[model samples]
Target chain A: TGKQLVIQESILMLPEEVEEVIGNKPESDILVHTAYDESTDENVMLLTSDAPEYKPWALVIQDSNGENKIKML
Target chain B: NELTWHDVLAEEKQQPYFLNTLQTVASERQSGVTIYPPQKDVFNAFRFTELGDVKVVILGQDPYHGPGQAHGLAFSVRPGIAIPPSLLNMYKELENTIPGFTRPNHGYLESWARQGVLLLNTVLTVRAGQAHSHASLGWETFTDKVISLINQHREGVVFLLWGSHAQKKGAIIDKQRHHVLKAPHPSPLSAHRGFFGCNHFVLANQWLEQRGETPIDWMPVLPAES
Candidate 1:
């Protein structure tokens, strides 16, 4: 079940824009913006509040492609 | 308005067109066409919030056109389903406007429905994967009757009309008797326009209190996920 994740360009999007992405594939695995690690230069997509992440903004991400996964970290 | 759900159901059942529409939907399923929301949940809005229990009404244009998304409540999916874009926008607005509100992991809004919020959709049923596929199936007549009944019978019920579609449907709502709050649709395309800071949720609670009714808990504590 493990596929090689593709590191695509990190596209920053507003919540409204993220909503569009989520709407297109609603049934897919979805995640929200919990935080952005500046050191790692990746956005946190965790859902649990106790994950020690701090971010006010909400964003959405989906595994749009079957094998070429969108890297969360 | 002396109309109740029973009366509406009884009347619609007797209507020739409505009956035929039901048959059409049934035949569609028989012909191997999939419809969103199981038949049992088609009337969940009415069944959950009875006529007398209605305090607030949020109008959605149609059910979500994806598998396991629509569950008879407008803008609401099942407990474990992913939240759709429009509803996610709604949550964003709520997080901004309502105090102590945070987006839930799941998309279900049945807690609001149980608390007298009727999440009624203008068109109740739709073909799977197709928006507005059932628009011409006489659902408009039945839903229009629902709105009219609420408008005539209910006093001081808050109507949250988002987008032109809901606003048009809400035109029949007598603002003199009930509260009407209009904002842009919560779709990502329109949420930035005016829906973000609309404060419809807080306004609804305040207006309900002013009308001597119990204010709704917009962010109800959901039960533990099993």
Candidate 2:
């Protein structure tokens, strides 16, 4: 069985907050939900700024291992 | 995975309100009053997406009141029918958030349901041409029970609640075990308020992936042009 046996929880936060909190973390630690922009030729983080309330542009979760799983919402 | 009604929702069918609701619907049909989504399709959501397979729940207030628009799944109309404003708004947001998402001419949402998106309306039936006509007719009671059962049986599922009505119905969901995303309704009157840039589809897939489940496609695979 391939299981990490880790418990995790997530919190919504601003994009800037996610960057500040997870500074210097390994790339695997951050999971930004993104879409490829043809014009920018890059995967841009999907942000919900248009809907200011109930959203903060990111979902930051901490696992039992104390590892931060940052996801851009 | 097959999440049978008997396994999880048999109790709801046996409840008193359910019988009364059925009788009311039956009486309406007997009197020759038209009902949207014909009787056979009332449970299409459940029939297509099982309880075990439900990864995300999108709750609507009631079925579409127009002819050929309601078909058990919320915000979904039969193919060839003109897209409703709220559902059209849903497509607009999806196109904005999800990369490569194409807005289809039709508004049928069965593909999303099959992919584990539970498109359930609080009031399952509405009289033709009359919105919310079936509102206090025991449908809410049954749907409320459905929500509670899903909350209890599943963990890490996403609840995409639009508008105050849907948000209230999802209040009982245990946030500790599931993800609840709230936003303004997608109806034309409110889409501009906050629904337009909600990015819920992207967030829903991210949350599901984090839980080690397959993400829903969210895109409806439309029939190819003839």
Candidate 3:
């Protein structure tokens, strides 16, 4: 099965506490890159990692409904 | 232990009064009673034992100090202690704006304590010097003790860990046996988080009703003179 991986670059730029506590791991383990899409007002960042194990991690940082979900095989 | 409501009420009255007396007695017995280097915080010990069948425990952080203040009340102050203008204003507002604030006849502390709520402060003791120095240190120690106590009572107890310190304490709480709820601290600083939203008082009563147990009305409102 193929899954599209997505992440926010702003999250990557934040301090370590937000990263470590939120992502449950150091940011060094995750690779972050940005891509512009005209379809949306906000810029999108693509996140990837050589460590397949990390794919099961998702970090949501919204104020009210923010959530983090990771699925593992 | 088959303790009845009457027994619980009696114990509640005796414990705090006895503890206060003991504190005075112990202090008197010590030699010299030299004031040591003041700790950074002020810790107070309070006992509440009022909720009928539902046993709830509340842990407050520290005491305020000024003058004309009761030793165990609000902030610790010496005789002729000057009340902080801000605190005085807060009380005034509560008295005027909040309907039940002053009318409850029972002072806020007594209302809850009599209702089977075990109220304890983190730093159990504080000296005049300790409060004079770094008063917040007392709160820090109290926070640690709150966590430790909750962990011990995780089973058969409903713990309300309010405030950031309280929520952080919840991380160590075993959620299986104990029903733990976390909310913002009741300080005006975090009132925007809807202090009423996390109304443990109402939730506690509901919890007791669902369990077919008597609810302790320990909301700190004064009871009418009998």
The prediction achieving the highest TM-score against the true structure is 1
Ordering by TM-score: 1, 2, 3
Task: State the TM-score of the second chain for every model.
Answer: 0.94, 0.94, 0.54
lDDT of predicted model 3: 0.39
Q: Which rank order by lDDT, best down to worst?
A: 2, 1, 3
Q: Is candidate 2 or 3 superior in lDDT?
A: 2
Which candidate number maximizes lDDT?
A: 2
Docking quality level of the chain pair in candidate 1: incorrect
Candidate 3 per-residue lDDT over residues B1-226, each given as its tens digit: 4333334324533555445644553564374453321222122223334223236655543333222233343322333333332232224334544444452322335444455565554433333322322232333443454445445533455676555444544345667666677665433222233343555655665676677666765423433464
Per-residue lDDT of B1-226 in model 1, one digit per residue for the tens? 5556876668778899889888999889888999877888899999889998899999876676566777799878777865565676678778888887877787788889989999998778877655556878898888888888888767888889876567754456887898888876665334565678789999998888787888787774567564
List per-prediction Cα lDDT, in the order shown: 0.67, 0.67, 0.39
Question: Mind giving the per-residue lDDT tens digits that candidate 2 earns over B1-226?
Answer: 4255665467778778898999889999888998777999999999988888888999877676666667789888888876665676688788889997888778888899889899998878877755456766898878888888788767788999886557754457888788999986664333554678788999999887787898888777765467
Total clashes, candidate 2? 0
Scored against the native two-chain complex, candidate 1 gets a DockQ of: 0.04
- Which pairs of residues collide in candidate 2? none
| Candidate 1 clash pair list | none
**Alpha-carbon deviation at A34 in model 1, angstroms:** 21
Per-residue lDDT tens digits for candidate 2, residues A1-73, read: 7943111111112333334444522222222222222243222232233211323344434322224455644
Per-residue lDDT of A1-73 in model 1, one digit per residue for the tens? 7963321111112333344433332222122322222244333343211112222233333221111123222
